[PDB]
Design a protein around this ligand. Sequence first.
Ligand code: HEM
Ligand code: HEM
Ligand SMILES: Cc1cc(N)nc(CCc2cc(F)cc(CCCN(C)C)c2F)c1
Ligand SMILES: Cc1cc(N)nc(CCc2cc(F)cc(CCCN(C)C)c2F)c1
Ligand SMILES: C[C@H](O)[C@H](O)[C@H]1CNc2nc(N)[nH]c(=O)c2N1
Ligand SMILES: C[C@H](O)[C@H](O)[C@H]1CNc2nc(N)[nH]c(=O)c2N1
Ligand SMILES: [Zn+2]
Lengths: 413, 408
Amino acid sequence: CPRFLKVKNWETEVVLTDTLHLKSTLETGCTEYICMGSIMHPDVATKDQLFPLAKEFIDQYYSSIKRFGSKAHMERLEEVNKEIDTTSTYQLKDTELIYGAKHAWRNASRCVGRIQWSKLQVFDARDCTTAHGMFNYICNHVKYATNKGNLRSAITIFPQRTDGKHDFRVWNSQLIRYAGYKQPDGSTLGDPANVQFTEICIQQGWKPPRGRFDVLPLLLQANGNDPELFQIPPELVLEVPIRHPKFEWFKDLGLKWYGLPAVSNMLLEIGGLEFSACPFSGWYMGTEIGVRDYCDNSRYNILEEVAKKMNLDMRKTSSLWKDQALVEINIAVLYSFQSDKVTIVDHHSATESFIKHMENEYRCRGGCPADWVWIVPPMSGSITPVFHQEMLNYRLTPSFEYQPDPWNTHVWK
Amino acid sequence: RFLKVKNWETEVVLTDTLHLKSTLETGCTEYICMGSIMHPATKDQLFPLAKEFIDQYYSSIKRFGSKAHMERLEEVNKEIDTTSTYQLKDTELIYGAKHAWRNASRCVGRIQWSKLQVFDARDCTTAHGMFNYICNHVKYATNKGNLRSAITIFPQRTDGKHDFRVWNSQLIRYAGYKQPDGSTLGDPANVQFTEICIQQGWKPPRGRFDVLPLLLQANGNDPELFQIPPELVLEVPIRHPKFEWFKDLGLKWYGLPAVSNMLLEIGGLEFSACPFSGWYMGTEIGVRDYCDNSRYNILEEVAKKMNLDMRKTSSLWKDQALVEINIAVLYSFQSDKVTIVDHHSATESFIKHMENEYRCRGGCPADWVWIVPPMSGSITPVFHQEMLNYRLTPSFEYQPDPWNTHVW
Ligand code: HEM
Ligand code: HEM
Ligand SMILES: Cc1cc(N)nc(CCc2cc(F)cc(CCCN(C)C)c2F)c1
Ligand SMILES: Cc1cc(N)nc(CCc2cc(F)cc(CCCN(C)C)c2F)c1
Ligand SMILES: C[C@H](O)[C@H](O)[C@H]1CNc2nc(N)[nH]c(=O)c2N1
Ligand SMILES: C[C@H](O)[C@H](O)[C@H]1CNc2nc(N)[nH]c(=O)c2N1
Ligand SMILES: [Zn+2]
């Protein structure tokens, strides 16, 4: 592998030099002959597998605190090694847990929000034993991160995997999401993305209000036991009704969205350890709501109704009625969040911040892994600076990974 | 191994076997993906490349292993022996040019690939001859607004000291002028090329839409300047269906998009001058050509006339102006009956193209980074389509700009 790789920005002519790719760990999916960069997704560690993974992480941590090679570094290596020897696993120190969580975000190639990576509040929930305790930790997380609309990024880390039969899992894909209900006539009420999970909740005992914006309950699994349902206290769920600065009729669509984006189905890998329940939250980029949640054909799919109320000609695609309506919806989302003083970032500001972040990471860290397919926003791509920015994608650890949906693997008791 | 691609909107899964036929490199490795990087012979090297191509040609006309096929391989073998190269048959040239288009991972317009008019210009020897062939190309392809895809293929590379080159990046482009006060008049993408034309004796009108002259190099000689006859250059004044003030911006564009700086590789042969043309997707003009910060950069002026609040990015004033400019472009070409496709229709057609190629060919190499349009990405169906990118040959390739290699 070449020692230096160059990326160019075709708008500004700036050339950056990447050396950090030499620390790349796992596989991208690509080969010399095929690129899988647009593919969305392209039994535990043995003692022998765990030793080198832990050492790599411990070495990285002690290098970051400028104590590489120190007595405390060598002693930490020996203590971890003994622990892996006698128990087949090991426990992270609190400092190492925090460092690992921040760096999994720092390394998340698909995240445009990483300029914030070092300001992550880490909640250590490794003492949790029950689904009720998970609910308590999650409620505290949601309250802290929401902060009356002055949102603060945060992660809550539940106990790591042991033998794979005692996993902690949040069955929700996000902590706060709206239910979706398939109707006998084929239509869907609510969010079509969540129909499968909604049906699971109903079978587990949830009584669904069957509305358009019903906050789903938490479905929480502790220590490999069957998951249990809990209702998030509604006063902890900050929501924003969507209105438009010019179009008085926009509020009559009855749209609203929740303020806190909180991913809860990913796995956090630190030093070979696997944290299968690690819900983390930030704040929204407006297009995540205004383009994807609202205008995806397979989601709320409101382009039609908005275009109608805008009195656009919808018979020819070349009138760009979809495009025109999409912008108004995204204007409404940003205006409504700003009016209610709920943190949100538009796609222009976020991508400009990410370029500055990337350049800083290249200069101070030797690179910044980035997934262009995900970094470029889903509207107006080429009038954002990331569109013209060449990027290198590679996998560094600590990392957030996808994992199978737990209902596909769980052994019901 | 067989590889699957999923469309996350429709849940359609396709199975790719065609990638097993690729042998060029992508630039990626198992550890680093370069998917967003823009740019990642001898007798001995030539015959296996020739053999592979002759093989796939005779397989395509269902006479693989025929007597004609055996004879052609031997014919090619002797010719590489006695001359260090070979000459394609006319049928092979046409097949190879259509397949270079069919294989172009970055082109959303490939549903048309087999409707390509191929002009054989391999008997050309001088820049005057190139000019004549290019004028005929432009006239045929323009067709009074009913655009027709075409490619003109000039003689192949021999020793590399005798290349045919079109120095222009496109056959028709507007000049760009570095102003005294530091800014730029016209098209900033072409400032360097414009200056080379001036340095070669071109008298610039110093307007905003001055069609550049052709700078044509034949057989490695110094390039020569030619003016395309203006009656051959179809242009469209841009106006807006609702904003009557839009025409007062004084904007226009040319109807014929015609790439002239790429290299066509067929069976190991390299055609360094191979201008090819189709018709525009509206966003190529209205998003990239007009609104890139390094291009015409008119978002400010348009948003001004729309009286948009331009003090905060979160008003999305840039996004609103962007849509209106692209409405105007489509409306203007359609009103003048000049072929153009919008990004919704184009990506729809591409999804249908992919389905066809997976069925009859076992796959379709596609570069998501280039296929997804530069605006309103996720409300087009390609945004949700997983794609596999791999290099098949015949292919179009980038090459260095001739002013960096040429000795005068
Ligand atoms: C604080 C403000 C943040 C912003 C504005 C932001 C923005 C984004 C956006 C727009 C995406 C693409 C979302 C999509 O299309 O589904 C994304 C992906 C991602 N973000 Fe961030 N994010 C933020 C915070 C965080 C935090 C705190 C973490 C973890 C500690 C994180 C980790 C990730 C990961 C792992 C992905 C990839 C998700 C996947 O591949 O499925 N982000 N982010
Ligand atoms: C007929 C209508 C056509 C349409 C609508 C179309 C559309 C497009 C678009 C929108 C791009 C992206 C260009 C950019 O972003 O700069 C592209 C790229 C490309 N097209 Fe097509 N195209 C057409 C015809 C053709 C033809 C006739 C050929 C060759 C015979 C061709 C070969 C290519 C190649 C090689 C690229 C990649 C360019 C590069 O890598 O820089 N296209 N096409
Ligand atoms: C922390 C955070 C901040 C932010 N501003 N945005 C997000 C994206 C929210 C999101 C929404 C979504 F629909 C899908 C995924 C992928 C991961 C979740 N699982 C489905 C794998 C997401 F991350 C996350
Ligand atoms: C045949 C054809 C049809 C069409 N509809 N579109 C194109 C692309 C036009 C284009 C525009 C542009 F700005 C940059 C590049 C790549 C660099 C090549 N240079 C020759 C310009 C382009 F291919 C080609
Ligand atoms: C097929 C393609 O990989 C898929 O649609 C991706 C494209 N880019 C994306 N980018 C973001 N930010 N989020 C997404 O869900 C997707 N989806
Ligand atoms: C850095 C990045 O590869 C570069 O900006 C690419 C992105 N995608 C593109 N897509 C198209 N269609 N045309 C382009 O010029 C580019 N430029
Ligand atoms: Zn790749």
